[PDB]
Amino acid sequence: RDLVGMPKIGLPPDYLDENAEPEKKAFVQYCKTVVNDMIANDRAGLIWPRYIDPDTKEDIFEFSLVSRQGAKAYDTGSIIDRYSKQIMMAFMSDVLAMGQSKYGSFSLADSKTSLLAMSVDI
């Protein structure tokens, strides 16, 4: 659901009416096609109308990508790794992640047996 960076189109309310003139309907259909089919490409570009209202000084049309301010408060990777290591510790089976070290052995007749082998003996 991370939605940062998606395109957004702003149009005057009268463009979205059902009885609007054919020109506005064609404009809305073209906007829909653009939204559906725009991708990063060697021909990417836009020609967009631009009009700033004299009494508000804000563009009536707009084209921009949604932005976000804050950042996630928790790092999930570290927590997941910690809990995985905790799970692996319960069975004393850390060999799965740390490999077979030379200081441990799987033989019960050898004086380097690991805890996993000792419990399998039980």
Partner: peptide
């Protein structure tokens, strides 16, 4: 708790060996 459980279980395993 996994830590307490593992600490107790290792001791229990050693005695039964």
């Amino acid at each position: 708790d996994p830590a307490v459980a593992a600490s107790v279980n290792i001791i229990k395993m050693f005695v039964r060996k």
